[PDB]
UniProtKB/Swiss-Prot annotation, chains A, E, F, G:
Coiled coil: none annotated. It is found in: Virion. This is Intermediate capsid protein VP6. Homotrimer. Interacts with the inner capsid protein VP2. Interacts with the outer capsid glycoprotein VP7. Interacts with the outer capsid protein VP5*. Zn(2+) binds at residue 153. One of its GO terms (cellular component) is T=13 icosahedral viral capsid. Intermediate capsid protein that self assembles to form an icosahedral capsid with a T=13 symmetry, which consists of 230 trimers of VP6, with channels at each of its five-fold vertices. This capsid constitutes the middle concentric layer of the viral mature particle. The innermost VP2 capsid and the intermediate VP6 capsid remain intact following cell entry to protect the dsRNA from degradation and to prevent unfavorable antiviral responses in the host cell during all the replication cycle of the virus.
């Protein structure tokens, strides 16, 4: 595997540092590495493809070295080189793709394809070099069993979930109390509603709570917390819990009272914030708990008083809410986020070549399904597959 | 006939594609050539469910 | 090339006038059929070379070394076939010959063999030196045949304890290489691929059309090859057969190692020299299997090796030019007569 | 070559194996419809691809 | 051009690796490259500026090369160097800016300025070196006529468009049916409304559809699709299509029924998703088609039934919607996105120096206007201009 | 300080380029640099920790150098090396953290810890090299006094502020006129409301204005400006200015009329946009001014006319709004943004080790408090502390 | 590819400059080139055909050189030569045809056939020569990514379109107002009709407009513009827009009033002509806009007055029109025109060999369909295919 990596940084730092002009001395250290490769390869034979709509292609090697002679570089030098690179590019592409499709339950971590299995061979190890590409960097550290870690912008930790829970309801759905939410990606919006505006509630306050359990721990998270859930601030006609009928939600928004956000790790409070809106840091957590209340306004102007009568019908439904967004965070496990193309690359190659559903990944590499049941096997396969996608993107985008 | 030659199925629909409009060519014939097949060809000969 | 100073002294009237040298290339590809004549060119180009290759200097007194050698060598210890490893002498010469000889060979794009001497294992060790550098690519397949197998068998394999099945080659893939796939001592293992793959990088087009089959920066003065050739040697010290064997063998090996600090120097030397001289060759030079050889007694080789000090010699300015000048003329004549030739023939037809 | 008369709207052309949108022909269609066996595409492209 | 690039990576890798102390043998390979430059330059004269409020500064060259001795670097060494760098910096800045304003209908892909035209000269090619900066990387691969590609977080593919289409309307605007939307940047929000709540519609279902045609194909797109269009979930007073009057929109939101998103390429469905909210992948498309329906609730509690009478006046307007956001994608053409400063750099330099409107770009480099009529000439000029901005940002931010 | 930097890029470019199988010559230039270090170190002893819960560990050096004759690295070579690296890693971590907690009002721009103060010593300068990490790059350029500059995605320039201003109000709060807003991070949403729908206003138009003063100048900003403030488009019950009662806000949204956005710098208009929604560039500004109007619709269908009577009660409250988001920008001062983990790293290390509140930073490194009173001392300390966090993240994430 | 080219100019300049008589000296430079070929070929083996009704043919090479001896050419010399040429001719034909049928979506630009793919090989490049054939000339310049350009007589830029638009109509179709047109090839004819002869129109003038958007920009166009649309100057019975009935058009022609032709490029007016009939130049445009009016004659003789009553029935329908023809123009993209046989050659070879419809081109290479959806893939394939047709026509017509 690491082998694979090199193959690319070789080509990149190649198709990059080798051009009509420059001095030999700037590539001397490079040129070498290169040749070294050609050698180890030549003589060997390969095979890629064979699954689904993926073409089968065989490759052989028999190439000349490089003029370690010249001082500067003349156009002619390049072209005779670029011609050799292009065969490797078109090669690697086919190599990546071939191993970017196969999955495996037992050992979903190690190589699969006839192409790569052959590379992990010892006789090729004579090629590793410059592993500064964030992903491979972490691939190694994990082999040696040590503390890994990646960086994500608007991570995708929450499987899509949009629902409600009626804590007080009745057939007519004319005096409900409960919460409704949307957990998706890196965002959570949750609203607590009480049709009665806490008219008969102790201290005229109704307590609400929303708990979200992450499938993986996030550390170093920069989070935006804002009062109100705009998504649940407008009139709605919703299906009843049993699907037998529809209820009416006509919200009027009040400020959430006694807001408390807790970021817990294994049941322990790691970070807690009381009514702090704006930017907050959650340094290590696997669970978020949002507690907030609706407090009936003790003093009301006529217009307000008119919305909240002492007796039904309750026509304006008191609602309080919160919005929480994880802007960035670090995770020890690979995840999809709003910037990296890994998930999209893997999903795209599989879709383009009509790769059949396998035993590990959900149909279509569906993110929600994947993160909902993020088993060790899915994670090992995902990491292998994401690391390969990242190796491929160094040359082919 | 949109095709080799006259033959109710294809052509008669290819022509008298009466009642329909607001889009592109093909679709209209296809459509009117559909009407036949379907609801018609069935009460005759074909495979599977 | 820093080491060399340049300067102008005389002026030039707008009266100045010269005649183009005319250095078109080959025009005639004799490289694919006229063996008989190539052999004659190579030879020529070769002698030419020796005439140039600077003579060496500051060597270690012949006597001194060979003497510490006997102390280390444990010569007469049972073994019947004595005084065959010391016909090494005349080194104050052998090295000079081995040195020159080696260059020209290369430059002149010649190919050779080896007055080899099976018994004399030392003479073999040094062989390993030779392949470590000189791109086997230009060594008639055969002389390499003997050499390697002699190493492979009467060395490594058994003293290293590995294949006590000594070995058996045919004529395609090489005993120096395949041995690889089947060896477990990385150090040993790198030598193998590097030696079997160091193909005199037959690819160059410099200073305007001068295909002069070149050679590795690595080798050049990255040298390490040597350092690695040594490190691999540093762990070949073990069992299998009689005592007077390992004792004698390894002891010799060490003389390569210590000296290794210097052996380095050798690499640099050639590296430069060839890499220098070459510059002034107009005639292109495709690698060809000459019909004739050139005997190179591991005798001399071995000498050069442990026998070079902090010496440092290079091509005298005047020397270099003289070289250019010649090839030049020659070329000019070749090209010219060619024209003179053609012209006639064609006329001869209409 | 799956020729699919998506009644009302649509029409697609495959290559029976590795599926693939590709020029649909009112012509090639014409005949091959007229007199050959048809199929009541249970599942169509959309669902299939 | 490529020439230009070097000039910088030269200086960066310079103003970076040349500090009081470091060991020489870390810059040996570098030092060289540097000198090589000075040489090629010395003996040349340049001129930049001359347009609008851009000064016309003149430059000459006549410098010495650095020492090669010294195990380590002494302070003195640096300062005598930094003094030489600063003249090149202040130079390049002026060079970039001068070629970052001119546009040419014809060859808007070739060099313009007297400054650069002179660089493409052959005698300067001896300076090229280390082309690994993502942009130049792609500049080359294109000049050779090959497959390019870039990376963008929240790309800016949709020209701003905020409008509506009334499929059923009447003078009083008291029983409308149609859609309203906002396409902007990487986001689309669209709502379908039916004042009658499909009371007389077949199967009590009203079909809606929203089609968006991209000006460039996006591949590898990671997309968030969510039900509801919050932007169109509140009461509005809107201008009529003819601008003669204003209508009232009083939405009540229902879940979009039979949601189907199609990502098409040249009329062909490449990806299709049926009612899948959350994260989805669209691997290659030039068009997005969102189809969704409003289905009159078959069962209604009294409160709901009251909103939807059998006869007008229709006072609560049934609305269904969708929100789609392209988090990341790859495009073969340069585009503005939410992270890169290229567009802003080009636009800013032109604004600061009062550069007159030219024949290629819309006034103010207006993004909406640019992407709406993204002609080949605008793209070639944009790419040239974006690549220069990226070269400049390696040294000057 | 710069010293510190090296220590890492040394290790990274080390734990990266040093692997089982790379040719020696690909690290010749590197190996050296490394050894050079060991030397300078060995002998001197260090103290880290000694505050809050941070442990006081003692580090001592006694190491043998690295090879020189290897032409391809064997496994054994690595392991004997990795063993030495791991002591430095675990070291630096402790070094960073120790200087990442101390603050100082007077000189809070220099080294504090006994650990680092010792490094700035001259006898160590001999290590510095490859200063390409964006942050250190700017650390230097500032020590010499020049144009610094960083890059941010969704910068965090606006301290959280959510409030309103009633320009016309009365006890019953039944006919208000004013604005309400939310400034947070990189976003601003502001709404102007007039319960009377400008019935008695000159030209039936009510003018609104929202001014936001940045604590630091932003240059090169790519900004999204959209009409409407969704956050203020729904019914609300709000506390009165004096907290004595609650008022009712029942918005109906109209398009903002005569929208004008001005990006000012020191009172001067640098950029101005009239009713331009979508993507706009603000090249240099310290203030944003949003002016917009509510114009009573001159022509109204019955449904609309019914919302706006000639006399109270005013039951539908005319509202116009704007949304502005800074997608990216450059700032000469460090700031938190939506992608970088610096703030989170610093905040997290302090929280984990129970570091006591100091004299410079607000409790909990609270971003809003920090940016609200972004004094020179807080900025110098923040930059020092952010630069260290970035050095640490090269090795430990 | 370029390779291919040579092969021909070789043969042409051969079957042309080699004949019973002439002096060697006139071909000396030629002869050489020739031989050079034979060599490179000999030994190699080929294969063409295999698709549709195209025969499969294998070819081998083993030919003698040419007598570079004589002062003149004797009949015998020719015949021994012509015999060798004829094998190459019959060869190339089969080569062209084989690559003139295959299409490809992904890479529709590069070679397809086993025959050609082998030619792009490096070992054959030893044959290029004299690329003055207009098409290859442009093939190269496009590889180097530069400004191309072709020449066309009566270009074929307008997909066939013959229709009408009724701006005022009623069931009886007895008082219509609108336009009808025919856009086809290089010509546009458009008529504006008003059954009422602008009797109730402001200023007794009815405005008309016809806009045509080209799929590719045309530069350097020489255009004939004439008043009147003869095609729409005669009585017609036309189908109604909905196809439910037929209407009667009984035109009487008046001179078009206030004629204005605008040639726009990306929305900008590049050329504008006011009432100028005859020959006009449009130098660069992607859109043509024709505006013209029908002005009711202010003074009418009895015979004229009788045609235009104050009240219906309107029996003579006032009509004004324009005719525009693009005689010649330059386009950066290949197009069909009235002189070149490229489209016909490609279409003919495909038809003759019963080549199956592929994934790129419309059935039958239909021009209207092709130009209507002239995608990048269709253009790249068209150019490849047109360039091959042009190479073939140098030898086989
Ligand atoms: Zn973002």
């Amino acid at each position: 595997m690491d082998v694979l990596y090199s193959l690319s940084k070789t080509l990149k730092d190649a198709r990059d540092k080798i051009v009509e002009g420059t001095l030999y001395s700037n590539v001397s250290d490079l040129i070498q590495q290169f040749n070294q490769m050609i050698i180890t390869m030549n003589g060997n034979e390969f095979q890629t493809g064979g699954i689904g709509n993926l073409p089968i292609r065989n490759w052989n090697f028999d190439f000349g070295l490089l003029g370690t002679t010249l001082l500067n570089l003349d156009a002619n030098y390049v072209e005779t080189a670029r011609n050799t690179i292009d065969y490797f590019v078109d090669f690697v592409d086919n190599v990546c793709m071939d191993e970017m499709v196969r999955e495996s339950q037992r050992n979903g971590i190690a190589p699969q394809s006839d192409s790569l299995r052959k590379l992990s061979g010892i006789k090729f190890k004579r090629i590793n070099f410059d592993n500064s590409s964030e992903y491979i960097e972490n691939w190694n550290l994990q082999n040696r069993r040590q503390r890994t870690g990646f960086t994500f912008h608007k991570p995708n930790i929450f499987p899509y979930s949009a629902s409600f829970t009626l804590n007080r309801s009745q057939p007519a759905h004319d005096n409900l109390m409960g919460t409704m939410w949307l957990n998706a990606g890196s965002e959570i919006q949750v609203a607590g509603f009480d049709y009665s505006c806490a008219i008969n509630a102790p201290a005229n306050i109704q307590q609400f709570e929303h708990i979200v359990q992450l499938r993986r721990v996030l550390t170093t998270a920069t989070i935006t917390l804002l009062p109100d859930a705009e998504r649940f601030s407008f009139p709605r006609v919703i299906n009843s819990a049993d699907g037998a009928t529809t209820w009416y939600f006509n919200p009027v928004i009040l400020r959430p009272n006694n807001v408390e956000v807790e970021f817990l790790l294994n049941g322990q409070i790691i970070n807690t914030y009381q009514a702090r809106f704006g930017t907050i840091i959650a340094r290590n957590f696997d669970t978020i708990r949002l507690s907030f209340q609706l407090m009936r306004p003790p003093n009301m102007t006529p217009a307000v008083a008119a919305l909240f009568p002492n007796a039904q019908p309750f026509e304006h439904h008191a609602t309080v809410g919160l919005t929480l967004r994880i802007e960035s965070a670090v995770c020890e496990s690979v995840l999809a986020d709003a910037s990296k193309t890994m998930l999209a690359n893997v999903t795209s190659v599989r879709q383009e070549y009509a790769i059949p559903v396998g035993p590990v990944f959900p149909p279509g590499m569906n993110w929600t399904d994947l993160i909902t049941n993020y088993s060790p096997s899915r994670e090992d396969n995902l990491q292998r597959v994401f690391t390969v996608a990242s190796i491929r993107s160094m040359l082919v985008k | 006939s949109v095709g080799s030659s006259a033959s109710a199925w294809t052509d008669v629909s290819t022509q008298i594609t009466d009642v329909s409009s607001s889009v592109s060519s093909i679709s209209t014939q296809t459509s009117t050539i559909s009407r036949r097949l379907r609801l018609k060809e069935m009460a005759t000969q074909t495979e599977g469910m | 090339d820093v080491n060399y100073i340049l300067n102008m002294d005389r002026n030039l009237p707008s009266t100045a006038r010269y005649i183009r040298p005319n250095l078109l290339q080959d025009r005639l590809n004799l490289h694919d059929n006229f063996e008989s004549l190539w052999d004659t060119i190579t030879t020529s180009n070769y002698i030419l070379a020796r005439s140039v290759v600077p003579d060496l200097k500051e060597l270690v007194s012949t006597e001194a070394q060979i003497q510490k050698m006997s102390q280390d060598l444990q010569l007469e210890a049972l073994t019947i076939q004595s005084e065959t490893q010391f016909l090494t002498g005349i080194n104050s010469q052998a090295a000079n010959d081995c040195f020159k000889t080696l260059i020209a060979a290369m430059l002149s794009q010649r190919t050779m063999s080896l007055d080899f001497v099976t018994t004399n294992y030392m003479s073999l060790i040094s062989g390993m030196w030779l392949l470590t550098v000189v791109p086997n690519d230009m060594f008639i397949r055969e002389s390499l045949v003997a050499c390697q197998l002699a190493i492979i068998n009467t060395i490594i394999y058994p003293a290293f304890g590995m294949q006590r099945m000594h070995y058996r080659n045919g004529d395609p893939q090489t005993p120096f290489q395949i041995a690889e796939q089947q060896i477990q001592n990385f150090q040993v293992a790198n030598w193998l691929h590097f030696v079997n793959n160091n193909q005199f990088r037959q690819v160059v087009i410099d200073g305007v059309l001068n295909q002069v089959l070149n050679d590795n920066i690595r080798n050049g003065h990255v040298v390490n090859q040597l350092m690695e050739a040594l490190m691999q040697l540093s762990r070949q010290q073990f069992p299998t057969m009689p005592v007077d064997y390992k004792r004698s063998i390894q002891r010799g090996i060490l003389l390569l190692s210590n000296r290794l600090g210097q052996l380095v120097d050798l690499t640099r030397l050639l590296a430069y020299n060839y890499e220098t001289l070459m510059a002034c060759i107009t005639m292109n030079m495709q690698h060809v299997q000459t019909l004739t050889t050139e005997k190179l007694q591991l005798t001399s080789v071995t000498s050069l090796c442990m026998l070079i000090g902090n010496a440092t010699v290079i091509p005298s300015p005047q020397t270099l030019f003289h070289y250019y000048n010649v090839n030049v003329n020659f070329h000019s004549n070749y090209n010219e007569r060619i024209n003179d030739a053609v012209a006639i023939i064609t006329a001869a037809n209409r | 070559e799956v020729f699919e008369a998506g009644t009302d709207g649509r029409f697609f052309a495959y290559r029976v194996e590795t599926f693939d949108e590709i020029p649909f022909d009112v012509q090639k269609f014409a005949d091959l419809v007229t007199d050959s066996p048809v199929i009541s595409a249970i599942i169509d492209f959309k669902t299939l691809k």
